[PDB]
Write a protein that binds this ligand. Structure first.
Ligand code: SRM
Ligand code: SRM
Ligand code: SRM
Ligand code: SRM
Ligand code: SF4
Ligand code: SF4
Ligand code: SF4
Ligand code: SF4
Ligand code: SF4
Ligand code: SF4
Ligand code: SF4
Ligand code: SF4
Lengths: 363, 417, 363, 417
């Protein structure tokens, strides 16, 4: 016998809603009824209603069972999540759509919304993709779950409606190794340090493999100390990425007062209208202010409300910038351009800017 | 008020995570007091008390992880310890388990309940739905519980395996694709699972210089952020013409501003509308999706389907953040996917043989050059791989491309060349 | 007393034709009358005609003496050269313009032309900026004067008339340190090597400062060899740039059978309509074939004719490509894309792609 | 024939450089035969012969040169020696003297006649009009003749000094500017001359880590290729409105297609035409010049004039070819140009202090960063310096910007900060 291994996840096809299983790869068109409700008509003529809700991502198993109770009812015991950590139900009988929407709100407190209609041209804010934060991670500069709650509270109304002229993605990373699509979002919140690491010589000797710690620094600020058998850090060359702390517990760069978040904009993943773009820093640093992070929230709101105001139907934030330029962008958003925003990261090769970072090309 | 700073975040309209954590501990302690087989009822409370201290301190309270796993596997379990280990005993070990999600995150209620049963028993009752990569996150358990927990997950009527972590093939993910989406250019969910199954060993037993991720997107809309979030982004596309029902377009123009909201927005001017006919120059089309996005009843992807492969996508670490670039302009997606597998293996053989410690595939290509990368995958250089030819004349030439000369014979004579 | 030094060039203002000195900074407008002939009208009412002629750049002093005789006869003893090395005369009597043109043509064999007219949108090909080649330089891969002569013979009709729809600059660099603005030219001819150097240890030891020779290598292919007090070359990393031979006579890499020219396109210097751009390689290599370099000339002419045949009015090569894309460019020019053309020059920083290399910005 | 390969280049319609060399040979030989004081009657014919052997071998026959100069100067004369010196002794020494041009290449015939007489006497009789930087090139003389040639030059009725070469300020150059051009935003010729005179020492006596180039363009058309070919590109611009003559625009509207040739080609859509009234949104205009170029009788640069300075322009060596980027969005250009001279001297000091052997100014800025560069020239960062802000979060913060913290004190009492 022995403990069975190497069997993988369940086969997805066994976990499909019957109407979905039958009409697989055979749909005619979709239709957004109202915000949070999307209709899908099959080539067979069958009609199923997908219904989307915001989740905190982090779920109690009890808030899981309680979703399964709802699932058996409105949706034949079938269910799914999204790529942005929303939850979607599948209702056949369209009279029981609102019942679902209401029961969900009273049972678990999960708002209906998170959708968008490109056809008409009206968009809603979807969930924020984020990570662990102080809940579980050993190298964060900020905490995801908290800021997410604080931001979405302010910008709730946007998730619930289609009040936006184009698609806006808000995403978050708790440190520089930027987990999630954070480097490619319309608005990004990125945990940064602003303080170099003070080496712990004792902790390094016993635990740290030095040569790979030294090799993992992108600016070369680290040099092996032969003596001594420790690491030396050139403060002039450190930009507080904290990669050395990832590699070595003897290299903390943590300072509660100076750690914070940068805000980046102008990212894009889809091909539609224009090419994918990496996010760009437009606010160097805002403080950690648990629990409401009011400075962060105000600056995200400020930015989003600026682009919302000006942007033409479909025109995303980076597309807006394409049109007005960064000169007018910094004015309207009311942000200041400092030297911190001039790229100085030496190691990335120029030739990457010449590669096709897109599926867009002619045959 | 035990937790004054966290309680402020139970307020507000957005679903509170603080509410989620409280809801867990309270019911887990309610279960354990009722004689239930709960090994960690104290788990979620201690987590809340530590997070409360972290909010006060404005710093993490988790230290570096003493490595841990299950029998047979090397990855899938991430070790974590609290530096308040003695003050809050129940979070001295709070290890995460990554549970392989079903392709496209589809679930029946049973499957989910099964997961809850095992985790209530062996863990903190705290989960993430879903993790960034796509895995189910079992958040917080001890070292000697890992082994029995894995036994039982596999013995469930709907059984789940462990996902990928460390220097392995990570758990692949895929957009909803053909399960829900009329845009799908190929069966994303089948491809995701087939891959996950084919390279089980490379996922569970990390052997590579670093991590490697694969994400499958139904169409160029990239609904799983594959180009940014994976080393190997398999994105659906087509070769022939966008299929256009002309009457359906008249149904739009009855109300829609097709000239402004479609025509003028097409990157390459390929799409024309005069009031009667819509015309698409598929020679000029870059299959950006917008027009199909605009008029999904009317417009559709072509019949000749497959995928473009974008290589390199990664977060900034070491050499810089990467949105994947074009590696294979077109490849067929048909079971058992031999053409895609042949590619992946060739890349892995090469990356294992040549990759430095903690070097991502994209950094390796950068270091080695596309010429080497292309010969490894056995493909020709193609103008579609670049946004523009090189802006300097510093080209490497292969030995065999040179005219034989007095000089090349000189090089030969000395064993260089 | 002692030898006079530090006195500089003659003050230009004492060398300006009286009508030009009088109306300095007081021009109404210019009109291109016909190829080679530009009318300039001053606010004062003075009218001067600037008549332009192609030159081989390498001039005989006896040619300079001839041009002086002509200048005394037609332009009151005044003359200039342009920034692409054409020569210009200043005629006030409009009825003498053709006497001049004909007399220049006859006496020195220099053709009138090398102009363009933005207003009507009709453009001449001007002179090819080029350097020393084998005439005087020790680091060339190709000749300069021979190739320019061979290209200008074939493209001559475009020098004397306004036959092109936009500006086309053709520029030649006899090696990779591209003396000139060859690196931002609509069509650039750039000499290259394709063979690595063979260290001459004796010459290196005697004449080369090792550390700066080593550090002159962009790819780090050179290492000092303490033992034999010389330099070792790692052939795998050498891309034959020639820089080490610029530094050190003990490092030659010339091979007369493998030296040749790359052809680059799509450079733009002016701001007009779109930003400046560096030229991009589209033909990796063509051989030296003196005296006519037929293969090189054939490709330059092939590229020019394809752009001319499809280019809209004003639309320079890079603007033509902005429109059609590189896919259609290689098809229309009949050129092959190979892996050589994929940029691999690692040292150049990505951040330079993010700097505003241009005077276009909003106030 | 003596030169069958070069003879081929006496054919064809383009004026022949071979004819130029041969003419020199014939007439220098004739002049010397006539008793005229000509020290190098054979130099031209030696060059010709070496060039013919070069065409046959397809390689240079020049070697690395010895250092050579005129008394008092360390630059401006570049030694060149042939490897064919025994076979052709008249070209064994064949150095170039770079003679500083008048601003904008303006001459009277008396000036040129002076140059021709001096070079006839002491040199090959071969010249370039002009060197790529701008200088007159005296192509080919012997070492013993450099000094007496320079002396003769300096004693001419219209005298000519040596330009630059080596690690110095090279000979600045200027487009024609206000002498002939209605587009000029400043006096290019005057500025050029003034910098040349002001920094004679920096030009004649190389003292820097490498070469430094200045070029002066009167307007954004950049007719001296300054941004590609000079480390410090002074490019004319304006701050206020384009001057529009409406009646003149109507005179254009009668024959010219303004919508297609002007309106649709403006990079920012700032210029509108409705059939009666031309409008310019000068808040949207980026001063590209196309509209003015299209309509010089109607449109003029604005009244508040000066220059944008572009920094770093260079050929590839070391770190890549550079078109210069915005260092100074706007500076006034008024005699005696104190603001420009200030910027220059600050840059030079800093570069002399920090530069490596053979490091260009552009490369130093890439190495030290724009922050250090901007403080050196005492100016604030401006959004006009970048095409976009940084695509990564790895930012350096200065000490004074950080909050006073237990950590900042911990850094202080450790010898770091
Ligand atoms: C729900 C979800 C499917 C899934 O879970 O697998 C999804 C679903 C669809 N996406 Fe998406 N997208 C989903 C991830 C995305 C995200 C990826 C991400 O953020 O992680 C974006 C890429 C972000 C980016 O570009 O930076 C994405 C790029 C798009 C584009 C956006 C249009 C644009 O202008 O860029 C299309 C176009 C559209 O609006 O119809 C699109 C269109 C669609 C369509 C309309 C396709 C269809 O006809 O069914 C699907 C309906 C959703 C809707 O609200 O209209 N979907 N798609 C996605 C999860 C996010 C969520 O819960 O809100
Ligand atoms: C589990 C997850 C957090 C989450 O719940 O969202 C995670 C969390 C960690 N990541 Fe990650 N990464 C998670 C997805 C990502 C993604 C997004 C994705 O995979 O779709 C990225 C960007 C894409 C990429 O891989 O480049 C990402 C980029 C990184 C980086 C490495 C990036 C690089 O430049 O090479 C760090 C650094 C490292 O690996 O040492 C890292 C490493 C880590 C470590 C082990 C922290 C560390 O520095 O040692 C994390 C463990 C904390 C913990 O115990 O939970 N993680 N990480 C994410 C996966 C959930 C899942 O399994 O489904
Ligand atoms: C005489 C000369 C300046 C000098 O001091 O010597 C000059 C003079 C003029 N240039 Fe220029 N440019 C001169 C070299 C240049 C070069 C620099 C170079 O090629 O090395 C270019 C920059 C090249 C580039 O853009 O890549 C240059 C780019 C322009 C522009 C841009 C054209 C465009 O469409 O991008 C204008 C616009 C125009 O066409 O009227 C221009 C326009 C002009 C105008 C029309 C301005 C005026 O109001 O008089 C002048 C008459 C040119 C004509 O033939 O129409 N000039 N101009 C130049 C000698 C060139 C020759 O013999 O052929
Ligand atoms: C004379 C001239 C060629 C011509 O016929 O026009 C010239 C000729 C030489 N150049 Fe140059 N350059 C000439 C203008 C340029 C220009 C353009 C300009 O000045 O407008 C550039 C590009 C801008 C720049 O400087 O980057 C230029 C970029 C170079 C490069 C190095 C640039 C770099 O850092 O990459 C080399 C290599 C070096 O500096 O050692 C160089 C070096 C040389 C050497 C000394 C050859 C060598 O490898 O050491 C030249 C010897 C010629 C000879 O012996 O007869 N020359 N060179 C040009 C100057 C004459 C004048 O005074 O007007
Ligand atoms: S982004 Fe950083 S802090 Fe957040 S989960 Fe990833 S590694 Fe941890
Ligand atoms: S924080 Fe980053 S830059 Fe600083 S020493 Fe550590 S790895 Fe290097
Ligand atoms: S990527 Fe394409 S097929 Fe997949 S869900 Fe998005 S729009 Fe549909
Ligand atoms: S898919 Fe995009 S590029 Fe193609 S015709 Fe439609 S809008 Fe244009
Ligand atoms: S481009 Fe090269 S060969 Fe030509 S003169 Fe300049 S350095 Fe010499
Ligand atoms: S030729 Fe260029 S790449 Fe080769 S060793 Fe010399 S400097 Fe380096
Ligand atoms: S740079 Fe401007 S001012 Fe100078 S000649 Fe050219 S168009 Fe006239
Ligand atoms: S100068 Fe250029 S940007 Fe300004 S109005 Fe004219 S064409 Fe437009």
């Amino acid at each position: 016998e022995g403990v069975k291994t190497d069997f993988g996840p369940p086969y997805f096809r066994d976990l499909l809603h019957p109407v979905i299983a039958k009409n697989y790869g055979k749909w005619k068109y979709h239709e957004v009824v109202k915000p949070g409700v999307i209709k899908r008509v099959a080539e067979s003529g069958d009609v199923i209603y997908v219904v989307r809700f915001g989740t905190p991502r982090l779920l109690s198993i009890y808030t899981v069972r309680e979703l399964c109770d709802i699932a058996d009812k409105y949706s034949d015991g079938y269910l799914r999540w999204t790529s942005r950590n929303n939850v979607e139900f599948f209702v056949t009988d369209e009279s029981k759509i609102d019942d679902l929407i209401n029961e969900v709100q009273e049972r678990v407190g999960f708002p209906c919304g998170g959708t968008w209609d490109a056809v008409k041209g009206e968009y809603g804010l979807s969930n924020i993709v984020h990570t662990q934060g102080w809940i579980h991670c050993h190298t964060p500069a900020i905490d995801a779950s908290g800021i997410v709650k604080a931001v979405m509270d302010e910008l709730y109304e946007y998730f619930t409606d289609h009040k936006l002229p184009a698609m806006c993605r808000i995403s978050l990373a708790c440190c520089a190794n930027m987990c999630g699509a954070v480097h490619a979002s319309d608005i990004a919140i990125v945990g940064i340090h602003r303080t170099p690491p003070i080496p712990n010589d004792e902790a390094i000797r016993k635990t740290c493999e030095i040569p790979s710690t030294v090799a993992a620094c992108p600016t070369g600020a680290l040099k092996p100390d032969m003596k001594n058998k420790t690491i030396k850090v050139d403060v002039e060359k450190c930009m507080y990425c904290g990669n050395c702390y990832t590699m070595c517990p003897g290299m903390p760069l943590f300072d509660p007062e100076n750690d914070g978040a940068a805000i980046m904009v102008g990212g894009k993943l889809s091909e539609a209208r224009r090419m994918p773009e990496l996010s760009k820093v437009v606010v160097p640093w805002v403080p950690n202010e648990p629990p409401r992070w009011p400075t962060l929230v105000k600056y995200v709101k400020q930015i989003l409300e600026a682009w919302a105001a000006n942007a033409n139907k479909h025109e995303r934030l980076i597309e807006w910038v394409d049109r007005i330029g960064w000169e007018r962008f910094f004015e309207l958003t009311g942000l200041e351009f400092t030297q911190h925003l001039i790229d100085d990261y030496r190691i990335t090769p120029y030739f990457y800017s010449e590669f096709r970072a897109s599926t867009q090309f002619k045959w | 008020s035990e937790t004054p700073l966290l309680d402020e975040l139970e307020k507000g309209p957005w679903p509170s995570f603080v509410k989620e954590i409280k809801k867990t501990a309270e019911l887990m302690e309610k279960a354990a007091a009722e004689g239930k087989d709960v090994k960690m009822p104290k788990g979620a409370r201690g987590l809340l008390k530590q997070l409360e201290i972290s909010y006060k301190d404005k710093k993490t309270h988790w230290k570096h992880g003493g490595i841990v796993s299950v029998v047979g596997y090397g990855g899938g379990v991430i070790g974590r310890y609290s530096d308040l280990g003695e003050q809050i005993p129940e979070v001295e070990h709070f290890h995460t388990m990554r549970i392989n999600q079903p392709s496209g995150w589809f679930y029946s209620t049973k499957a989910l309940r099964g997961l809850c049963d095992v985790w209530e028993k062996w863990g903190s009752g705290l989960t993430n739905f879903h993790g960034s990569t796509g895995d189910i996150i079992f958040l917080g358990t001890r070292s000697e519980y890992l082994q029995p927990c894995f036994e039982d997950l596999g013995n469930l009527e709907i059984p789940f395996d462990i996902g990928g972590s460390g220097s392995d093939l990570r758990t692949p993910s895929a957009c909803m694709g053909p399960a829900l989406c009329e845009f799908a250019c190929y069966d994303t969910l089948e491809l995701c699972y087939d891959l996950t199954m084919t390279y089980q060993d490379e996922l569970h037993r990390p052997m590579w210089p670093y991590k490697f991720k694969i994400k499958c997107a139904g169409c160029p809309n990239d609904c799983v952020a594959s180009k940014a979030r994976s080393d190997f982004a398999i994105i659906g596309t087509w070769k022939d013409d966008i299929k256009v029902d002309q009457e359906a377009v008249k149904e739009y123009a009855s109300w829609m501003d097709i000239e402004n909201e479609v025509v003028k927005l097409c990157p390459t001017g390929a799409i024309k509308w005069d009031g009667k006919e819509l015309t698409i120059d598929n020679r000029e089309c870059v299959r950006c999706m917008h027009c199909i996005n605009k008029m999904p009843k009317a417009l559709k992807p072509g019949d000749e389907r497959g995928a473009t492969i974008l290589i390199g996508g990664k977060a900034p670490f070491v050499e810089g953040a990467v949105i994947g670039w074009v590696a294979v302009p077109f490849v067929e997606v048909e079971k058992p996917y031999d053409e895609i597998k042949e590619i992946l293996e060739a890349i892995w053989d090469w990356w294992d043989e040549e990759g430095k410690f903690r070097e991502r595939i994209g950094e390796l290509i950068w270091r080695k050059g596309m010429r080497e990368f292309l010969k490894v995958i056995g493909r020709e250089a193609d103008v579609r791989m670049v946004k523009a030819p090189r802006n300097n004349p510093f080209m490497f030439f292969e030995k065999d491309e040179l005219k034989p000369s007095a000089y090349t014979e000189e090089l030969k004579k000395r064993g260089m060349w």
